Amino acid sequence: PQITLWQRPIVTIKVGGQLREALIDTGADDTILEEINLPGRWKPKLIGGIGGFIKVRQYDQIPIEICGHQAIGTVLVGPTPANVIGRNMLTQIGCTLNF
Amino acid sequence: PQITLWQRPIVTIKVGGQLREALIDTGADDTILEEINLPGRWKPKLIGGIGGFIKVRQYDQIPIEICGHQAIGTVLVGPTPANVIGRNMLTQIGCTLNF
Ligand SMILES: CC(C)CN(C[C@@H](O)[C@H](Cc1ccc(F)cc1)NC(=O)O[C@H]1[C@H]2CO[C@H]3OC[C@@H]1[C@H]3C2)S(=O)(=O)c1ccc2nc(NC3CC3)sc2c1
């Protein structure tokens, strides 16, 4: 779709067999989801944003469906205040900015 | 322009008579700039992001040029680790997401 920015650009995702809503976030390099149960091995990572840093679990090669488009990549899980789809996944679904 | 997301979507802005680079940030409701000298009255505001919250100076009705497009609106100034152009300004320049 085309999405305008009068409201938060929230879309439906499926990840780890679970449905969630997430922000299309061009200011996010990586994809970060609130506590969600994902399978398998992970590595602890500290990431930084406005306000400071959080500890996340890094999961690699995680399949995700983003508004009906398929991607696979790194998903970081931790105490983010918002589920954010970052550029690592947005590049796979052909998402662009236009003005 | 159209901007793809293989790299950070950074553009040149002019604000307060000064030139800066800033991220086109669809996950940002508001526009937040690192310490920059802006004229006139401001109101202290606490904003939240990943990692916690920052104190910012809120300036209203600030003109900004964003990659050659003119906007006017609220600009928050404070210890953000990145200059971010949020939806309050991106809607004025006709910025959309497309996939
Ligand atoms: C700040 C920006 C530069 C980065 N963030 C992406 C922004 O879009 C976030 C998303 C957000 C929304 C709401 C919220 F409560 C918290 C976060 N917006 C944001 O904080 O908005 C703030 C601010 C703007 O106005 C209002 O709107 C929402 C809220 C409020 C005040 S990030 O989430 O920290 C992030 C994400 C991925 C990532 N991957 C990395 N990978 C390593 C480096 C290579 S680093 C990294 C850092």
Author numbering:
A (entry chain A), B (entry chain A): 1 to 99
What are the paper's exact sentences on this?
The inhibitors of HIV-1 protease (PR), an essential enzyme that cleaves gag and gag-pol polyproteins into mature functional proteins, are the key element of effective cART1,2. Blocking the activity of PR leaves virions in an immature state, which are unable to infect cells, thus leading to restoration of the immune system. In the present studies, we designed and synthesized seven novel PIs that incorporate the unique 6-5-5 ring-fused crown-like tetrahydropyranofuran (Crn-THF) as a P2-ligand as in GRL-142, GRL-121, GRL-001, and GRL-003.
While early-stage amino acid substitutions (after 20 weeks of passage) occur mostly in distal region of PR, late-stage amino acid substitutions (after 30 and 51 weeks of passage) start to appear around the binding pocket. In order to understand the molecular mechanism of drug resistance, we compared the structure of PRWT with mutant variants PRDRVRP30 and PRDRVRP51; each protein was crystalized in complex with an inhibitor, GRL-001 or GRL-003. Similarly, the structures of DRV-resistance-associated protease variants, PRDRVRP30, overlaid very well with each other when complexed with GRL-001 and GRL-003 (respectively). Although 12 mutations occurred in the sequence of PR after 30 weeks passage, the PRDRVRP30 structures show no major structural deformation in comparison with PRWT. Although the X-ray-based structural differences between PRWT and PRDRVRs appear to be rather small and subtle, such differences are apparently sufficient to reduce the affinity of PIs to PR.
